[PDB]
């Protein structure tokens, strides 16, 4: 042949730049993964094994490799778990496409072949899953507790798990609604006290103080979001301020969401100001010329409760407005105590959110990847044409996940994935790698499970990224 024009040079540049990112984060997979040392440009040195944090500190200038960075962010938004696993899977797929492109297979044939393997891969993981009931709070407690044990705090996971379950079951109808909004649950952490003290508030709890306004209590509140001449101007400044208050008073708004301190006290209006926009969205769904009564919310009793360890908080209950919202109050000795307490709540809410959309449980420890690679090999024998080798390359790329967990466990990566493949042939998905005992063991008895949405979204989002990279012919720099 000739191949004078070589567009594949950019293809190989995109694969090399994308594989370099997946090869780095690979060693951080699993609880036993090795820690990494990141040094900031200012000279600060930090050590963390979290994959989502390292990818943000890499400062990736390459366009194709930035797609994997955005791929990890899309995984945390939907499922919220398995950030490191997605980057590793997407890296092994592009590495397998290198051997296929050298054989002369066209990318569109490769791209369309992964879609058929993806549709078949979803059916395999679904049939082998374990259906569970969403209305049962015993499974939700055990699935969250065992999942948070592999997280940072394994001791207090038993306390924070029912706080997240009772919050979701309150804002979501059990076994009815398939969609859960994580922004409908607000977590407030303050210094002082201990994690043993937690309060689930059906209303909203904020961080603001009503100072210097001394009303501090408003019942049945409608909340809404919005030398002689020298002395005369001071009287005119009070007129302009009171003018805008008169229009508010006609509508009946007793609480405003932001010299005027005294005018708001005469009208018995609680002062809530310095509020973040993201915090307003939580209040938006819960409860001057354009200001009217129709845009006002509702409330029962507003007040500021000052405790020893929870600081100054605004407790507003009985909103009486269409919606379902709750609030969680978190206490703890130091800042790192309440920091990891809230981070464990986000991980708890994401796992519960995955169980609401898809009700199922699958084993961990590399089990879903080996069973997937086992059935796709037999499924590739029935296909004809170029789809035969493309599916086998998609199946063999699933071996990177179990081989990585076995490598971080000290075992032999080559001998482990070989023995497990025959265990799934005769047995079921229950077989897998147990990192706690350091050897091959039944994962079902180890009580290590993960929701189905984590594995399904991992294959769905990574495949769309791999197909998007292969379809790129070149890059053009405009101005």
């Amino acid at each position: 042949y000739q191949d004078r024009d070589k567009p594949a040079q950019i293809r190989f540049s995109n694969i090399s730049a994308a594989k370099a990112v997946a090869d780095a984060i690979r060693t951080s997979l699993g609880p036993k993964g090795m820690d990494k040392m990141i040094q900031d440009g200012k000279g600060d040195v930090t050590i963390t094994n979290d994959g989502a944090t390292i990818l943000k500190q890499m400062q990736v200038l390459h366009p194709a490799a930035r797609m994997l960075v955005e791929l990890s962010k899309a995984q945390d938004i939907e499922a919220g778990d398995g950030t490191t696993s997605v980057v590793i899977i997407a890296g092994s797929l592009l590495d397998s496409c290198t051997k296929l492109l050298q054989k002369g297979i066209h990318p569109t044939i490769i791209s369309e072949s992964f879609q058929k393997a993806l549709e078949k891969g979803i059916e395999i993981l679904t049939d082998m899953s374990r259906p569970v009931e969403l209305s049962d709070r015993e499974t939700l407690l055990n699935s969250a507790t065992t999942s948070l044990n592999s997280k940072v705090v394994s001791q207090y996971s038993s306390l924070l798990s029912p706080m997240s379950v009772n919050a979701v079951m309150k804002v979501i109808d059990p076994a009815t609604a398939t969609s859960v909004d994580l922004r409908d649950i607000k977590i407030v952490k303050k210094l002082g006290g201990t994690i043993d003290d937690c309060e689930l508030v059906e209303g909203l709890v904020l961080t603001q103080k009503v100072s210097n306004s001394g009303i501090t209590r408003v019942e049945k509140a409608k909340i809404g979001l919005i030398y002689a001449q020298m002395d005369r101007v001071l009287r005119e400044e009070r007129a302009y301020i009171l003018n805008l208050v008169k229009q508010i008073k006609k509508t009946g708004c007793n609480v405003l969401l932001i010299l005027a301190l005294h005018f708001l006290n005469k009208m018995k209006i609680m002062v809530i100001k310095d509020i973040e926009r993201e915090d307003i969205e939580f209040i938006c769904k819960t409860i001057i010329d354009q200001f009217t009564a129709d845009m006002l919310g509702s409330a029962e009793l507003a007040e500021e409760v000052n405790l020893n360890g929870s600081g100054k908080l605004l407790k507003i209950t009985g909103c009486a407005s269409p919606g379902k919202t709750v609030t969680i109050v978190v206490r703890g000795s130091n800042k790192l105590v309440i920091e990891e307490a809230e981070r464990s709540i986000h991980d708890a809410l994401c796992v519960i959110r995955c169980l609401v959309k898809k009700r199922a449980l699958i084993a961990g420890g590399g089990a879903p990847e080996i069973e997937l690679a086992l059935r796709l090999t037999e499924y590739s024998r029935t296909l004809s044409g170029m789809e035969s080798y493309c599916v086998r390359a998609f199946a063999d790329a699933m071996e990177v996940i179990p081989s990585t967990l076995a490598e971080n466990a000290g075992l032999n990566p080559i001998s482990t994935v070989t023995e497990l493949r025959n265990r799934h042939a005769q047995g079921e998905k229950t077989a897998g790698i147990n990192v706690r005992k350091g050897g091959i063991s039944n994962i079902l008895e180890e009580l290590v499970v993960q929701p189905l949405l984590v594995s399904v979204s991992a294959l769905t989002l990574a495949t769309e990224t791999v197909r998007s990279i292969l379809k790129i012919d070149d890059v053009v720099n405009t101005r």
């Binding site: 930035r66 066209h106 990318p107 302009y240 053009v476 720099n477 405009t478």
Partner: protein, 517 residues
């Protein structure tokens, strides 16, 4: 020291290569996007990382890229005219014009004078144009067959786009919008609405010319025999589009005087509007609540926040007039509308008309997750409405997918049998460029081009004028049975524009660049 300090002139040898290399590089850039299987491309501006994006559209790539070559600049300008006027074939014009110049460069190495090559392409153009006229098949009767052809043309235009997956539901939207028109091909009559939320399959359609905009705060939901009058002026407050003028305010009473002066100025404006005897009022500027109550007290519906596209469209759909000056009463024509009703689609207040004069208009309501999806959905839909409106004016249709491009190349070959000496070689390269279009389509699909394209030559050689390429099964079949066809005006426009674009490059043997300022 003939040309120095910024002034450069390429000689006959160098300006020859520079003219083609600059033009061929443009054609080779967008050639990967031809066909439904075409490749994507990444566009990133230098210095700004927020310009990242991926699109397979050949028209969008040529607009954002800069061109420093005056020879390649002519080819880019001819591509933008193709997209702005006809709307389809932007990639086809660029690729076909580039292949003519790539083959013309090899003929010059044979010492064939450029004027001789031009004389050959002019005779081959007439022979290739008559081939489409003989193969054009229209339908005077059988609107079912005429409507089915519109669905095939709409599904073909939507190919290689963001909507290509859901296009099956969109063919019913685009054809019905043009089918209800049944008349002049004015596209202002068909409004396009872009709303957030819902998937692409949730896009609705309204035949009563639904408005994308909401009016007022409290407005009547029904009105009988509403007279449409458009006006252009600020209805909100004083100092409209006036910068540099201030007002001295010494106290609060001075502000109340402005509020009284504002209500006094608005009252005089409402009086002149009511002297027209209208039941409805339209203006581009927002309407304040005080004149809104003056309109609601008299039954006049207050319409505000109109754009430039609204005044032009609201005039023809309702049969009204722009009427920028409402000062002199009853000197302007008023629109005719049977009913104006409020319809909520996408959690937004929308304005729906009924029984308007010439009520063949309609509106398509798009549904998408974000604005970037809606913007690309409108560009793909608007390009489809252009060729469908052209199909109503000329109902002749031809078969696409390599069928029409290969048929024209066969007529040029037979013309090469009777011809003088030098024009024979020139027309042969013209026929080879027509066969490059079905060849590139097969390359982007992964199929073997040399196998499929060469069989089409033997297919159209003896009978079988309807043969073509099938991308679905990767074989050759009847284009009439598979339902792949395009308009006749599109093929004639791409064929002539590509011939005129490549003709200008040959006529330029030298490029004189002056000293840049």
């Amino acid at each position: 020291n003939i040309f120095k300090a910024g002034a450069d002139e390429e000689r006959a040898e160098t300006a020859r290569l520079t003219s083609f290399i600059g033009a061929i590089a443009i054609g080779d850039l967008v050639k990967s996007t031809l066909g439904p299987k075409g490749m994507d491309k990444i566009l990133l501006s230098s210095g700004r990382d927020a310009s990242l994006m991926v699109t397979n559209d050949g028209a969008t790539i040529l607009k954002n890229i800069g061109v420093d070559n005056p020879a390649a600049k002519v080819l880019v300008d001819m591509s933008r005219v193709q997209d702005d006027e006809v709307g389809d074939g932007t990639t086809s014009v660029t690729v076909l014009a580039a292949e003519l110049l790539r083959e013309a460069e090899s003929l010059i190495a044979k010492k064939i004078h450029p004027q001789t090559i031009i004389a050959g392409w002019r005779e081959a153009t007439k022979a290739a144009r008559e081939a489409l006229l003989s193969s054009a098949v229209d339908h005077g009767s059988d609107e079912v067959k005429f409507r089915q052809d519109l669905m095939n043309i709409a599904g073909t235009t939507l190919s290689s786009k963001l909507l290509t997956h859901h296009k099956d539901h969109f063919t019913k939207l685009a054809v019905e919008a043009v089918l209800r028109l049944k008349g002049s091909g004015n596209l202002e009559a068909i409004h396009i609405i872009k709303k957030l939320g819902g998937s692409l399959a949730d896009s609705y359609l309204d035949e009563g010319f639904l408005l994308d905009k909401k009016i007022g705060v409290n407005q009547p939901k029904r009105i009988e025999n509403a007279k449409i009058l458009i006006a252009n002026t600020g209805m909100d407050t004083d100092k409209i589009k006036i910068f540099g003028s201030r007002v001295r305010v010494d106290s609060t009473a001075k502000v109340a005087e402005i509020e009284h002066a504002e209500k006094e100025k608005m009252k005089e404006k409402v009086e002149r509007i009511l002297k027209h005897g209208i039941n409805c009022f339209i203006n581009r500027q927002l309407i304040y609540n005080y004149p809104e109550q003056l309109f609601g007290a008299a039954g006049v519906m207050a319409i505000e926040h109109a754009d430039f596209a609204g005044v032009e469209r609201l005039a023809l759909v309702t049969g009204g007039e722009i009427a920028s000056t409402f000062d002199h009463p009853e000197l302007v024509k008023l629109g005719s509308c049977k009913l104006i009703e409020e319809v909520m689609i996408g959690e937004d207040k929308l304005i729906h008309f009924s029984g308007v004069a010439l009520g063949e208009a309609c509106t398509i309501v798009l549904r998408g997750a974000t604005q970037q999806i809606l913007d690309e959905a409108e560009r793909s839909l608007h390009d489809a409405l252009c060729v469908l409106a052209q199909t109503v004016k000329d109902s002749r249709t031809v078969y696409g997918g390599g069928c029409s491009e290969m048929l024209m190349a066969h007529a040029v070959t037979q013309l090469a049998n009777r011809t003088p000496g030098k024009e024979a070689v020139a027309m042969e390269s013209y026929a080879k460029a027509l066969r490059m279009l079905p060849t590139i389509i097969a390359d982007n699909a992964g199929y073997d081009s040399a196998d499929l394209v060469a069989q089409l030559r033997a297919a159209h050689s003896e009978g079988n004028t309807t043969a073509g390429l099938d991308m679905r099964e990767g074989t050759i079949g009847d284009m009439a049975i598979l339902g792949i066809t395009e308009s006749f005006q599109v093929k004639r426009q791409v064929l002539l524009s590509a011939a005129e674009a490549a003709e200008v490059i040959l006529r330029v043997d030298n490029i004189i660049k002056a000293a840049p300022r």
